[PDB]
Design a protein around this ligand. Sequence first.
Ligand SMILES: COc1ccc(CSC[C@H](NC(=O)CCCN)C(=O)NCC(=O)O)cc1
Ligand SMILES: COc1ccc(CSC[C@H](NC(=O)CCCN)C(=O)NCC(=O)O)cc1
Ligand SMILES: [Cl-]
Ligand SMILES: [Cl-]
Lengths: 221, 221
Amino acid sequence: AEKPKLHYFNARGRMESTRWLLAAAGVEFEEKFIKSAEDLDKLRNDGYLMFQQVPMVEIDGMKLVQERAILNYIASKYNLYGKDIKERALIDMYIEGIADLGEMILLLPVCPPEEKDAKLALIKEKIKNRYFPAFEKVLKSHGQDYLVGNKLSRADIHLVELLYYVEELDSSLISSFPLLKALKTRISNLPTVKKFLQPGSPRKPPMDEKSLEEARKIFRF
Amino acid sequence: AEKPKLHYFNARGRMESTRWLLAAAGVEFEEKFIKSAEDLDKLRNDGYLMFQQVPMVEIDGMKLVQERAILNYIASKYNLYGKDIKERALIDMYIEGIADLGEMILLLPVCPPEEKDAKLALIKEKIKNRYFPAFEKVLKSHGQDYLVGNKLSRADIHLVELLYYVEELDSSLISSFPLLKALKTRISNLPTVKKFLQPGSPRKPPMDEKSLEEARKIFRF
Ligand SMILES: COc1ccc(CSC[C@H](NC(=O)CCCN)C(=O)NCC(=O)O)cc1
Ligand SMILES: COc1ccc(CSC[C@H](NC(=O)CCCN)C(=O)NCC(=O)O)cc1
Ligand SMILES: [Cl-]
Ligand SMILES: [Cl-]
């Protein structure tokens, strides 16, 4: 069973959701960490990166770049993309909202320092008034344990990953959303996810100033 | 089955790729233009916008928001998403690179005035050195008339749409990419696309200063 190989630097960034999804699905992977700009250039010069960027995942004979292409593939392969085209639409709608919020959070430390305070406030406003109410409403609507189809899907995994990041940001933000809290708990207790959340897994820590500088070095921004 | 109904303002923006894809698929659709902040607020208040944003498309009983959710559903529904999981992986990689370049171009007029010139220069370098070479290389690899599976897919439609925007930016950018020029011609001559390119279709013009101010008042930015 040829192990997916994840090409990225040693940090969450744009590869972390893939780590979560693979782990949730019970899929053992290996990581090849990029440690320098010359490591990145070697991947490029070797023809591994369609758009000269990473993440790249070697899986099932493909060299897949673009986080959404990677995740869509994994989700479909491991039956985490719902049962039909209509369930996929709900899943897609939900996870695209999750991705918008996740992007805001991801880029927050790369924000011009003069914009950081207002943008943090905007994110917190959006969490409390836009995103968390949307997902709370979906869960309340059907009263089922999962977002879509009464069955585990990538939507549950991606939302719960985001809930962990929001907790890191401000642990109060979830406080008025009991159904999200309950989903976090249930999903975090699934054996594959529980193992991923335990010390020693490939799960990556929050990116510190230093890891961010290693990114600026490697990717030249 | 209802005719799909597209909720957006009367401009390209984030709904235009949906108009291209539906039109290319031969699917008749209706539009309901938002003209004020109040129209948008009515859709939000009445519960039809999961994340309080448009585009929203009413299709097959869903109120689908999020452009990628909308496009994924339409592509699957109309057999424009390839024939298997690995073809979808190529399609997704391709269209995610298209979206990255498209997003840059979309947001150019909303750049601070003093950053706009430098951002245009960077977009032009990326077109010439990163994106056009990637898609040229795909077309060269198989020499076929379509990007994937020797069959029209969403990737051909989204690519050709982008080639039209690039042409507006600078008609010289494609000049050294003969296979891209040929794809633009062929796809533009497909009966459905031809009709969409002709007058009187739902295709939208470039956004001018007056349309941008309309967006600023409806969406409050
Ligand atoms: C705040 O933390 C980070 C750390 C790294 C990155 C950059 S991820 C590597 C980058 N890839 C992309 O931008 C892919 C997006 C596709 N939709 C990359 O490879 N950059 C090199 C380059 O663009 O030349 C972003 C936020
Ligand atoms: C350069 O021209 C434009 C014009 C309008 C828009 C905004 S499109 C409407 C907006 N939707 C989104 O941002 C959707 C993104 C989901 N990934 C919207 O509804 N904004 C109101 C709001 O966010 O409250 C963007 C560029
Ligand atoms: Cl990516
Ligand atoms: Cl959207």
